[PDB]
Amino acid sequence: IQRTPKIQVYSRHPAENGKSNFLNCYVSGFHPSDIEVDLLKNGERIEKVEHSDLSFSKDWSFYLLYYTEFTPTEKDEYACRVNHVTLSQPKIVKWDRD
Amino acid sequence: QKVTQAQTEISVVEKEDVTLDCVYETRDTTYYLFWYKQPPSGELVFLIRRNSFDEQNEISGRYSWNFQKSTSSFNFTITASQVVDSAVYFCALSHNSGGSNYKLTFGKGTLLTVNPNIQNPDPAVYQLRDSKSSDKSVCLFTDFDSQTNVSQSKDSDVYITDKTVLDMRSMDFKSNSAVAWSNKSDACANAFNNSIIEDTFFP
Amino acid sequence: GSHSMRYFYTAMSRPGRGEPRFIAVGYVDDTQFVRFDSDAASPRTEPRAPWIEQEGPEYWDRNTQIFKTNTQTYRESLRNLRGYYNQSEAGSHIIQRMYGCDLGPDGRLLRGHDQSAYDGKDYIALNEDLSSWTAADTAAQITQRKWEAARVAEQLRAYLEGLCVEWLRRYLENGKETLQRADPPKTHVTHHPVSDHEATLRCWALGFYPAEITLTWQRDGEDQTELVETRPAGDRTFQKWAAVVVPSGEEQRYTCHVQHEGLPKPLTLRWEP
Amino acid sequence: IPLTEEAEL
Amino acid sequence: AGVTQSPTHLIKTRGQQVTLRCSSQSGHNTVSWYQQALGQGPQFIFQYYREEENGRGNFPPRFSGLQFPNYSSELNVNALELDDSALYLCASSFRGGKTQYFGPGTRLLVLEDLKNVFPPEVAVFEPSEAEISHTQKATLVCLATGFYPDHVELSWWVNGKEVHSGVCTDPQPLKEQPALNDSRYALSSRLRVSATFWQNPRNHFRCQVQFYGLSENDEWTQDRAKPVTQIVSAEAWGRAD
Ligand SMILES: *[C@@H]1O[C@H](CO)[C@@H](O[C@@H]2O[C@H](CO)[C@@H](O)[C@H](O)[C@H]2NC(C)=O)[C@H](O)[C@H]1NC(C)=O
Ligand SMILES: *[C@@H]1O[C@H](CO)[C@@H](O)[C@H](O)[C@H]1NC(C)=O
Ligand SMILES: [Zn+2]
Ligand SMILES: [Zn+2]
Ligand SMILES: [Zn+2]
């Protein structure tokens, strides 16, 4: 009933500076459904983000996929802000190209 | 889709095995078949539930059902038909019409009638008089074999009823009868110009 | 080739925030292909797969009407379970259900599934035999008692063995170019030094279907391994990798082994500088 | 196609 | 008591409002209404689920319905026509196994005018003295004439017990003259019993005839009395001659 969300920040394709890609934040295994997920661009909010469909795994734990268009650069650092009833303060997971 | 019962009416006698024919056409695979009996009261009683994954032959009591998916027919068989089994039998089909609803689709309806097995036929035409201080007269044709068919009055002022139907719960007495009457002149002898036969009592 | 079908229903309650919300998604193998939401002002069954868009309008009006009655069905289910535990009306609760038929290589079903849940806990389930049920608590027996006399499991045995198998089969033919054609992953090995004595060897597998994959690290003697597992890519393919901290200097000794359906033979990879 | 008719709890 | 439906028989004029009611079983949650013509099978009107219509088939919007939380249902039908005269059946289920438990039904009849409705004239007839010698049986003939409309239930009561053995009735009544569309009807039934049971002067026989006509609500403006729903019977006692 009480479950902590697992976060994965990655890209749809290998990150190459200058080329277009998709930035994915894959939250999985969290209860209940209510969750706040934001994508951060060096500290600012990214507008017009899209989320996947609400489904659950065989252990009755939910998983979502928040994605957006992103062109990786060397000096731009992105992260995923996830808030949930399980943990008190908002959680940040920075993006790693590897 | 549709359900079809080709048999319109059936005339059988007691202890005789009568089968009922019910065929269906249905492309979608999952469905629930049914059989209902409707006595003259008007209601339908629940007899059977058949499904798509069920067997081919299934018999329970005097009722014997034959569900096969190749012929797409659910032909019903009544063994040793009794007087109580005389009613209208419907076969329905629970398919998907539209969405979120398994609707029923009933066929035309098969009229089953069980006439008494008159082992000793003794046809006779008696006359009855009003009990309660009146003189209106009634004529009665009774105790004839089940193979006799009469229904034509062939006269306006003269009234003639056809063969009756026994009560379903009628265990003890089982006989065929027909009643004619009139309030004009000119009478019991001329009452039956319909299939009047050799072994008739005329008092 | 191979087939599987699943349906994921989800019903949560929002006291004061409106009526309960119902969410339904459909799956063939690991490819989602149906999507439904109750909160959309235009609530209609949306598709997520190219091969199903071929279906006519009667198919989509059917799937929409079914879910438009299931939202009222589970709303009463939320009120019923609220009464079994006499829970407060101001508490949020959720009901989850999964079902579907599993086809075999010969062409017929192997295992039909049906199971429900409440607040993340197992509530009720249909047995291996489709006829019976298995209750988890005292309240599950209340609902079980009703379905024992209403022949609810009778409906499922006729559906799982009937329309589900007939349509799970139709989906295999309409999308055999993607549902019956597996794609092996794009595999490579990376490396990043952490210290003078330690080093990280990460083995990548990209763009594979279905989701089942095995990634292990091994030294010629035996096998060890950090394994974040099977995230999706968003293109109906999944991505996965396994890493291991290796002593810098003895790096070449570690090998990566991949076991996947789309691969003709199991692979063995080594970080080649 | 999903299950046509659903029981309640 | 799971299956009820009120009322049983009803007569209305062309262009009125009727409201048929039905009670569901203790374990059921759906109500399905049907309409059966004299020759056809029960045709499916709408089905209701938890006070929201589930689905309807091949019927105009005037056929309406409503479901109450205590599993009570209605069938509000507007703008009646002469072809809306049929048997209206009520079904019930619980969204599980698709089995429909039908109710007793409701015989509805729509007429253009109510100036032709008449109760029957019942009269029994003692058996023939020559029949006692021939078959050793006694046949009692009952006759109800000059009544409109069609549906009438004819029961035989012997010694205060509704007997079913030895009873037979005509399948449908008889039009007195087939030339007229509004012709009155006539039905007849028979009761056969042993002669010794009839020759007993302490045994009585009664022919009950239940007639379904007008109700209290409907207004009457003719000189004769209102032909309301009434039971007209005829009795006869034993005789030995
Ligand atoms: C059930 O009874 C029906 C009653 O006619 C039989 O109907 C036959 O159906 C087949 C195909 O379904 C037709 O080719 C025949 O022409 C039909 N019979 C007639 C006389 O037309 C049906 O065969 C019966 N089924 C079984 C298994 O006995
Ligand atoms: C259900 O409640 C209504 C009140 O709205 C009442 O008229 C009806 O008779 C009730 N039915 C039963 C079966 O109690
Ligand atoms: Zn004789
Ligand atoms: Zn169509
Ligand atoms: Zn009646």
Tab-separated table of N, CA and C in Angstrom, chain C residues 17-149:
chain	number	residue	atom	x	y	z
C	17	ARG	N	-13.455	15.452	-4.963
C	17	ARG	CA	-12.880	15.882	-6.229
C	17	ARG	C	-13.660	15.372	-7.435
C	18	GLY	N	-14.819	14.762	-7.221
C	18	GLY	CA	-15.669	14.286	-8.295
C	18	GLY	C	-15.935	12.800	-8.185
C	19	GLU	N	-16.448	12.240	-9.276
C	19	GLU	CA	-16.768	10.825	-9.342
C	19	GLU	C	-15.496	9.995	-9.488
C	20	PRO	N	-15.556	8.704	-9.153
C	20	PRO	CA	-14.381	7.844	-9.338
C	20	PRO	C	-13.921	7.815	-10.790
C	21	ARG	N	-12.632	7.541	-10.972
C	21	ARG	CA	-11.990	7.565	-12.279
C	21	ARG	C	-11.618	6.150	-12.701
C	22	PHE	N	-11.895	5.819	-13.960
C	22	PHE	CA	-11.634	4.492	-14.507
C	22	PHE	C	-10.672	4.605	-15.681
C	23	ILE	N	-9.636	3.768	-15.675
C	23	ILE	CA	-8.610	3.757	-16.712
C	23	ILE	C	-8.430	2.324	-17.194
C	24	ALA	N	-8.425	2.136	-18.512
C	24	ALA	CA	-8.302	0.813	-19.109
C	24	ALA	C	-7.329	0.863	-20.275
C	25	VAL	N	-6.380	-0.072	-20.299
C	25	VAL	CA	-5.427	-0.201	-21.394
C	25	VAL	C	-5.350	-1.666	-21.801
C	26	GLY	N	-5.128	-1.897	-23.094
C	26	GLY	CA	-5.062	-3.236	-23.650
C	26	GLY	C	-3.666	-3.554	-24.151
C	27	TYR	N	-3.317	-4.840	-24.131
C	27	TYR	CA	-1.987	-5.288	-24.520
C	27	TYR	C	-2.073	-6.552	-25.360
C	28	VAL	N	-1.238	-6.614	-26.391
C	28	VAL	CA	-0.919	-7.854	-27.089
C	28	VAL	C	0.591	-8.023	-27.006
C	29	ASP	N	1.033	-9.146	-26.440
C	29	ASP	CA	2.442	-9.377	-26.101
C	29	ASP	C	2.874	-8.217	-25.203
C	30	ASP	N	3.926	-7.474	-25.547
C	30	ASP	CA	4.357	-6.308	-24.783
C	30	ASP	C	4.033	-4.999	-25.495
C	31	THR	N	3.092	-5.022	-26.437
C	31	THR	CA	2.720	-3.845	-27.216
C	31	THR	C	1.342	-3.375	-26.775
C	32	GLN	N	1.301	-2.239	-26.085
C	32	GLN	CA	0.033	-1.613	-25.743
C	32	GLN	C	-0.686	-1.174	-27.012
C	33	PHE	N	-2.004	-1.379	-27.045
C	33	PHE	CA	-2.774	-1.054	-28.236
C	33	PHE	C	-4.147	-0.456	-27.953
C	34	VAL	N	-4.566	-0.346	-26.691
C	34	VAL	CA	-5.825	0.297	-26.333
C	34	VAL	C	-5.574	1.268	-25.187
C	35	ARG	N	-6.351	2.350	-25.164
C	35	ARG	CA	-6.238	3.366	-24.126
C	35	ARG	C	-7.606	3.987	-23.894
C	36	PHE	N	-8.006	4.088	-22.629
C	36	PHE	CA	-9.273	4.703	-22.266
C	36	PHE	C	-9.116	5.457	-20.955
C	37	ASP	N	-9.759	6.620	-20.877
C	37	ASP	CA	-9.733	7.453	-19.686
C	37	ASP	C	-11.127	8.010	-19.445
C	38	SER	N	-11.507	8.101	-18.171
C	38	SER	CA	-12.814	8.621	-17.801
C	38	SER	C	-12.837	10.135	-17.661
C	39	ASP	N	-11.687	10.758	-17.397
C	39	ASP	CA	-11.654	12.185	-17.109
C	39	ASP	C	-11.663	13.047	-18.363
C	40	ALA	N	-11.394	12.467	-19.530
C	40	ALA	CA	-11.430	13.236	-20.765
C	40	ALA	C	-12.858	13.672	-21.066
C	41	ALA	N	-13.022	14.941	-21.453
C	41	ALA	CA	-14.347	15.442	-21.803
C	41	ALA	C	-14.944	14.668	-22.969
C	42	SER	N	-14.101	14.166	-23.871
C	42	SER	CA	-14.517	13.270	-24.942
C	42	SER	C	-13.987	11.872	-24.647
C	43	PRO	N	-14.654	11.107	-23.781
C	43	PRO	CA	-14.113	9.800	-23.393
C	43	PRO	C	-14.404	8.730	-24.431
C	44	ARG	N	-13.397	8.388	-25.229
C	44	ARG	CA	-13.542	7.384	-26.271
C	44	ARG	C	-12.338	6.455	-26.250
C	45	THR	N	-12.563	5.217	-26.687
C	45	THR	CA	-11.495	4.231	-26.785
C	45	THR	C	-10.476	4.653	-27.837
C	46	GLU	N	-9.266	5.052	-27.392
C	46	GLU	CA	-8.233	5.465	-28.332
C	46	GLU	C	-7.276	4.317	-28.630
C	47	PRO	N	-6.775	4.233	-29.864
C	47	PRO	CA	-5.820	3.171	-30.201
C	47	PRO	C	-4.373	3.633	-30.134
C	48	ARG	N	-3.454	2.700	-29.871
C	48	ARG	CA	-2.032	3.016	-29.803
C	48	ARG	C	-1.203	2.092	-30.690
C	49	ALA	N	-1.828	1.417	-31.654
C	49	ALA	CA	-1.116	0.473	-32.500
C	49	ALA	C	-1.569	0.621	-33.946
C	50	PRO	N	-0.647	0.493	-34.903
C	50	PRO	CA	-1.031	0.684	-36.309
C	50	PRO	C	-1.950	-0.397	-36.849
C	51	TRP	N	-1.851	-1.631	-36.356
C	51	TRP	CA	-2.606	-2.716	-36.965
C	51	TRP	C	-4.067	-2.723	-36.539
C	52	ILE	N	-4.417	-2.065	-35.438
C	52	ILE	CA	-5.805	-2.096	-35.004
C	52	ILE	C	-6.634	-0.997	-35.660
C	53	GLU	N	-6.000	0.094	-36.097
C	53	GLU	CA	-6.737	1.200	-36.704
C	53	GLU	C	-7.584	0.751	-37.896
C	54	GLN	N	-7.316	-0.444	-38.427
C	54	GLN	CA	-8.104	-1.007	-39.514
C	54	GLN	C	-9.546	-1.297	-39.110
C	55	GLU	N	-9.817	-1.493	-37.820
C	55	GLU	CA	-11.147	-1.895	-37.382
C	55	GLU	C	-12.173	-0.797	-37.648
C	56	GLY	N	-13.401	-1.226	-37.935
C	56	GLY	CA	-14.456	-0.316	-38.308
C	56	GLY	C	-15.039	0.413	-37.120
C	57	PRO	N	-15.967	1.330	-37.411
C	57	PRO	CA	-16.551	2.144	-36.333
C	57	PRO	C	-17.368	1.342	-35.333
C	58	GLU	N	-17.982	0.228	-35.748
C	58	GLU	CA	-18.750	-0.580	-34.804
C	58	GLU	C	-17.855	-1.173	-33.724
C	59	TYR	N	-16.590	-1.443	-34.054
C	59	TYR	CA	-15.644	-1.940	-33.061
C	59	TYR	C	-15.372	-0.897	-31.985
C	60	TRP	N	-15.176	0.361	-32.386
C	60	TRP	CA	-14.801	1.397	-31.434
C	60	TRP	C	-15.986	1.883	-30.612
C	61	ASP	N	-17.183	1.934	-31.201
C	61	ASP	CA	-18.370	2.239	-30.408
C	61	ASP	C	-18.653	1.137	-29.396
C	62	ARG	N	-18.317	-0.108	-29.736
C	62	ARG	CA	-18.494	-1.216	-28.805
C	62	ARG	C	-17.555	-1.085	-27.614
C	63	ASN	N	-16.267	-0.866	-27.878
C	63	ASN	CA	-15.297	-0.756	-26.794
C	63	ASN	C	-15.564	0.462	-25.923
C	64	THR	N	-16.114	1.530	-26.502
C	64	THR	CA	-16.400	2.722	-25.711
C	64	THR	C	-17.602	2.503	-24.801
C	65	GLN	N	-18.658	1.871	-25.319
C	65	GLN	CA	-19.842	1.616	-24.504
C	65	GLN	C	-19.529	0.668	-23.354
C	66	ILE	N	-18.658	-0.316	-23.590
C	66	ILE	CA	-18.293	-1.256	-22.535
C	66	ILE	C	-17.619	-0.521	-21.384
C	67	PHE	N	-16.668	0.358	-21.702
C	67	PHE	CA	-15.975	1.096	-20.651
C	67	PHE	C	-16.871	2.159	-20.026
C	68	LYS	N	-17.845	2.677	-20.779
C	68	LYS	CA	-18.769	3.659	-20.225
C	68	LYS	C	-19.761	3.039	-19.249
C	69	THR	N	-19.928	1.717	-19.278
C	69	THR	CA	-20.708	1.028	-18.260
C	69	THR	C	-19.839	0.440	-17.159
C	70	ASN	N	-18.561	0.178	-17.445
C	70	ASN	CA	-17.642	-0.294	-16.418
C	70	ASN	C	-17.270	0.803	-15.432
C	71	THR	N	-17.374	2.072	-15.834
C	71	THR	CA	-17.112	3.157	-14.895
C	71	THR	C	-18.228	3.280	-13.863
C	72	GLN	N	-19.468	2.971	-14.247
C	72	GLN	CA	-20.548	2.898	-13.270
C	72	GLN	C	-20.495	1.601	-12.476
C	73	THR	N	-19.984	0.529	-13.084
C	73	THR	CA	-19.908	-0.755	-12.398
C	73	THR	C	-18.895	-0.715	-11.261
C	74	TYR	N	-17.734	-0.101	-11.491
C	74	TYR	CA	-16.720	-0.045	-10.446
C	74	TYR	C	-16.998	1.059	-9.435
C	75	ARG	N	-17.730	2.103	-9.834
C	75	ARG	CA	-18.134	3.122	-8.872
C	75	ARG	C	-19.017	2.522	-7.787
C	76	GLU	N	-19.922	1.618	-8.169
C	76	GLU	CA	-20.680	0.868	-7.174
C	76	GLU	C	-19.796	-0.138	-6.451
C	77	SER	N	-18.791	-0.683	-7.140
C	77	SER	CA	-17.847	-1.585	-6.488
C	77	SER	C	-17.033	-0.855	-5.427
C	78	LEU	N	-16.699	0.413	-5.673
C	78	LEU	CA	-16.009	1.201	-4.658
C	78	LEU	C	-16.925	1.499	-3.479
C	79	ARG	N	-18.210	1.741	-3.747
C	79	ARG	CA	-19.157	1.962	-2.659
C	79	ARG	C	-19.450	0.676	-1.898
C	80	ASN	N	-19.434	-0.469	-2.586
C	80	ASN	CA	-19.700	-1.737	-1.914
C	80	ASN	C	-18.552	-2.119	-0.989
C	81	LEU	N	-17.318	-2.051	-1.490
C	81	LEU	CA	-16.175	-2.375	-0.646
C	81	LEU	C	-16.014	-1.375	0.487
C	82	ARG	N	-16.402	-0.120	0.257
C	82	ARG	CA	-16.412	0.862	1.332
C	82	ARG	C	-17.327	0.421	2.465
C	83	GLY	N	-18.421	-0.269	2.135
C	83	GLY	CA	-19.326	-0.749	3.163
C	83	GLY	C	-18.861	-2.014	3.849
C	84	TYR	N	-18.105	-2.860	3.142
C	84	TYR	CA	-17.606	-4.088	3.755
C	84	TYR	C	-16.637	-3.777	4.889
C	85	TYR	N	-15.758	-2.799	4.683
C	85	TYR	CA	-14.812	-2.355	5.697
C	85	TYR	C	-15.307	-1.133	6.456
C	86	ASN	N	-16.552	-0.710	6.216
C	86	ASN	CA	-17.137	0.522	6.744
C	86	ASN	C	-16.136	1.674	6.737
C	87	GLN	N	-15.375	1.798	5.652
C	87	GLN	CA	-14.392	2.864	5.539
C	87	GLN	C	-15.080	4.219	5.415
C	88	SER	N	-14.369	5.263	5.835
C	88	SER	CA	-14.914	6.611	5.784
C	88	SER	C	-15.119	7.060	4.341
C	89	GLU	N	-16.160	7.868	4.132
C	89	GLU	CA	-16.484	8.354	2.796
C	89	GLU	C	-15.495	9.394	2.287
C	90	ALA	N	-14.631	9.926	3.150
C	90	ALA	CA	-13.648	10.928	2.763
C	90	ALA	C	-12.278	10.328	2.475
C	91	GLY	N	-12.185	9.007	2.362
C	91	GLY	CA	-10.927	8.337	2.082
C	91	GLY	C	-10.853	7.887	0.633
C	92	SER	N	-9.683	8.081	0.030
C	92	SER	CA	-9.450	7.686	-1.351
C	92	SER	C	-9.026	6.225	-1.403
C	93	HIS	N	-9.633	5.469	-2.315
C	93	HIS	CA	-9.348	4.051	-2.467
C	93	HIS	C	-9.329	3.708	-3.951
C	94	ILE	N	-8.658	2.606	-4.281
C	94	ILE	CA	-8.415	2.239	-5.671
C	94	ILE	C	-8.648	0.744	-5.852
C	95	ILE	N	-9.216	0.377	-7.000
C	95	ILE	CA	-9.455	-1.010	-7.376
C	95	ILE	C	-8.755	-1.267	-8.704
C	96	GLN	N	-8.005	-2.365	-8.778
C	96	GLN	CA	-7.277	-2.735	-9.983
C	96	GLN	C	-7.646	-4.156	-10.389
C	97	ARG	N	-7.742	-4.388	-11.698
C	97	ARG	CA	-8.104	-5.696	-12.227
C	97	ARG	C	-7.313	-5.985	-13.495
C	98	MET	N	-6.940	-7.251	-13.668
C	98	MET	CA	-6.221	-7.732	-14.839
C	98	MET	C	-6.859	-9.028	-15.318
C	99	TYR	N	-7.004	-9.170	-16.634
C	99	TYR	CA	-7.552	-10.394	-17.202
C	99	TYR	C	-7.111	-10.512	-18.654
C	100	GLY	N	-7.393	-11.665	-19.236
C	100	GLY	CA	-7.028	-11.937	-20.613
C	100	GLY	C	-6.762	-13.413	-20.817
C	101	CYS	N	-6.663	-13.791	-22.087
C	101	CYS	CA	-6.397	-15.167	-22.480
C	101	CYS	C	-5.003	-15.283	-23.078
C	102	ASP	N	-4.395	-16.452	-22.896
C	102	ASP	CA	-3.057	-16.744	-23.399
C	102	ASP	C	-3.143	-17.883	-24.403
C	103	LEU	N	-2.809	-17.593	-25.657
C	103	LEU	CA	-2.831	-18.591	-26.714
C	103	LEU	C	-1.513	-19.356	-26.753
C	104	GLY	N	-1.584	-20.602	-27.218
C	104	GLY	CA	-0.421	-21.454	-27.300
C	104	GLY	C	0.097	-21.603	-28.717
C	105	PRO	N	1.286	-22.197	-28.863
C	105	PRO	CA	1.846	-22.389	-30.212
C	105	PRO	C	0.980	-23.254	-31.109
C	106	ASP	N	0.207	-24.182	-30.539
C	106	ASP	CA	-0.683	-24.997	-31.358
C	106	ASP	C	-1.859	-24.177	-31.879
C	107	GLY	N	-2.363	-23.247	-31.072
C	107	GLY	CA	-3.439	-22.382	-31.513
C	107	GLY	C	-4.552	-22.182	-30.505
C	108	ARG	N	-4.514	-22.910	-29.394
C	108	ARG	CA	-5.550	-22.826	-28.377
C	108	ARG	C	-4.983	-22.259	-27.081
C	109	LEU	N	-5.889	-21.981	-26.148
C	109	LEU	CA	-5.519	-21.344	-24.894
C	109	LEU	C	-4.689	-22.283	-24.024
C	110	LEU	N	-3.790	-21.691	-23.240
C	110	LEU	CA	-3.029	-22.404	-22.223
C	110	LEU	C	-3.420	-21.991	-20.814
C	111	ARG	N	-3.557	-20.690	-20.564
C	111	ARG	CA	-3.924	-20.201	-19.241
C	111	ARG	C	-4.728	-18.922	-19.393
C	112	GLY	N	-5.964	-18.944	-18.907
C	112	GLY	CA	-6.790	-17.752	-18.825
C	112	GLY	C	-6.634	-17.119	-17.454
C	113	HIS	N	-6.581	-15.790	-17.434
C	113	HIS	CA	-6.276	-15.039	-16.226
C	113	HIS	C	-7.396	-14.058	-15.899
C	114	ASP	N	-7.655	-13.893	-14.602
C	114	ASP	CA	-8.601	-12.908	-14.091
C	114	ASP	C	-8.277	-12.696	-12.621
C	115	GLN	N	-8.046	-11.442	-12.237
C	115	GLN	CA	-7.660	-11.129	-10.869
C	115	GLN	C	-7.974	-9.668	-10.587
C	116	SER	N	-8.398	-9.387	-9.359
C	116	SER	CA	-8.715	-8.038	-8.920
C	116	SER	C	-7.877	-7.682	-7.698
C	117	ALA	N	-7.916	-6.403	-7.332
C	117	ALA	CA	-7.159	-5.917	-6.188
C	117	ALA	C	-7.841	-4.683	-5.615
C	118	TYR	N	-7.510	-4.384	-4.361
C	118	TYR	CA	-8.075	-3.241	-3.653
C	118	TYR	C	-6.975	-2.581	-2.839
C	119	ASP	N	-6.752	-1.287	-3.080
C	119	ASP	CA	-5.746	-0.503	-2.361
C	119	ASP	C	-4.358	-1.128	-2.461
C	120	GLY	N	-4.063	-1.764	-3.595
C	120	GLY	CA	-2.801	-2.441	-3.792
C	120	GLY	C	-2.727	-3.843	-3.229
C	121	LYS	N	-3.760	-4.305	-2.530
C	121	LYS	CA	-3.791	-5.643	-1.958
C	121	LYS	C	-4.622	-6.568	-2.836
C	122	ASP	N	-4.187	-7.825	-2.939
C	122	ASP	CA	-4.975	-8.827	-3.643
C	122	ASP	C	-6.337	-8.975	-2.981
C	123	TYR	N	-7.391	-8.851	-3.784
C	123	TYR	CA	-8.766	-8.919	-3.308
C	123	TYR	C	-9.458	-10.219	-3.689
C	124	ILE	N	-9.464	-10.563	-4.976
C	124	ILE	CA	-10.177	-11.738	-5.464
C	124	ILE	C	-9.520	-12.158	-6.771
C	125	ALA	N	-9.651	-13.436	-7.115
C	125	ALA	CA	-9.020	-13.963	-8.314
C	125	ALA	C	-9.798	-15.169	-8.819
C	126	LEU	N	-9.702	-15.399	-10.125
C	126	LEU	CA	-10.246	-16.593	-10.751
C	126	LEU	C	-9.165	-17.662	-10.802
C	127	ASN	N	-9.556	-18.904	-10.532
C	127	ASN	CA	-8.593	-19.984	-10.374
C	127	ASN	C	-8.068	-20.460	-11.730
C	128	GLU	N	-7.111	-21.393	-11.675
C	128	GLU	CA	-6.608	-22.034	-12.886
C	128	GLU	C	-7.748	-22.677	-13.660
C	129	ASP	N	-8.538	-23.515	-12.990
C	129	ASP	CA	-9.852	-23.843	-13.514
C	129	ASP	C	-10.695	-22.574	-13.502
C	130	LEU	N	-11.384	-22.313	-14.608
C	130	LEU	CA	-12.102	-21.053	-14.741
C	130	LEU	C	-13.372	-21.009	-13.900
C	131	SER	N	-13.712	-22.093	-13.197
C	131	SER	CA	-15.028	-22.202	-12.579
C	131	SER	C	-15.093	-21.547	-11.206
C	132	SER	N	-14.009	-21.589	-10.438
C	132	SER	CA	-14.045	-21.217	-9.031
C	132	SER	C	-13.350	-19.874	-8.808
C	133	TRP	N	-13.275	-19.479	-7.537
C	133	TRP	CA	-12.627	-18.243	-7.122
C	133	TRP	C	-11.765	-18.522	-5.898
C	134	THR	N	-10.953	-17.531	-5.527
C	134	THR	CA	-10.091	-17.623	-4.350
C	134	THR	C	-10.130	-16.288	-3.621
C	135	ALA	N	-10.708	-16.286	-2.423
C	135	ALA	CA	-10.839	-15.082	-1.614
C	135	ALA	C	-9.582	-14.843	-0.785
C	136	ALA	N	-9.247	-13.566	-0.602
C	136	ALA	CA	-8.080	-13.189	0.184
C	136	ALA	C	-8.432	-12.860	1.629
C	137	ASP	N	-9.566	-12.198	1.855
C	137	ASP	CA	-9.954	-11.795	3.201
C	137	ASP	C	-11.399	-12.169	3.505
C	138	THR	N	-11.955	-11.578	4.566
C	138	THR	CA	-13.354	-11.821	4.903
C	138	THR	C	-14.290	-11.147	3.907
C	139	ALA	N	-13.951	-9.930	3.473
C	139	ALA	CA	-14.829	-9.199	2.566
C	139	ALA	C	-14.851	-9.817	1.174
C	140	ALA	N	-13.741	-10.424	0.745
C	140	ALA	CA	-13.711	-11.054	-0.570
C	140	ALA	C	-14.738	-12.172	-0.674
C	141	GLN	N	-15.050	-12.827	0.447
C	141	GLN	CA	-16.054	-13.885	0.437
C	141	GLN	C	-17.447	-13.332	0.169
C	142	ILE	N	-17.715	-12.096	0.597
C	142	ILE	CA	-19.007	-11.470	0.324
C	142	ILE	C	-19.235	-11.366	-1.179
C	143	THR	N	-18.262	-10.791	-1.893
C	143	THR	CA	-18.361	-10.703	-3.345
C	143	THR	C	-18.288	-12.084	-3.983
C	144	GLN	N	-17.459	-12.972	-3.426
C	144	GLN	CA	-17.389	-14.340	-3.929
C	144	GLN	C	-18.737	-15.040	-3.817
C	145	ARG	N	-19.456	-14.809	-2.716
C	145	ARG	CA	-20.750	-15.456	-2.524
C	145	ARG	C	-21.742	-15.047	-3.608
C	146	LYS	N	-21.687	-13.787	-4.045
C	146	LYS	CA	-22.597	-13.331	-5.091
C	146	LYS	C	-22.261	-13.975	-6.430
C	147	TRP	N	-20.973	-14.021	-6.778
C	147	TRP	CA	-20.563	-14.574	-8.064
C	147	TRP	C	-20.684	-16.091	-8.106
C	148	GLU	N	-20.752	-16.750	-6.945
C	148	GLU	CA	-21.013	-18.186	-6.926
C	148	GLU	C	-22.408	-18.495	-7.454
C	149	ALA	N	-23.387	-17.654	-7.119
C	149	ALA	CA	-24.772	-17.895	-7.505
C	149	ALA	C	-25.159	-17.228	-8.817
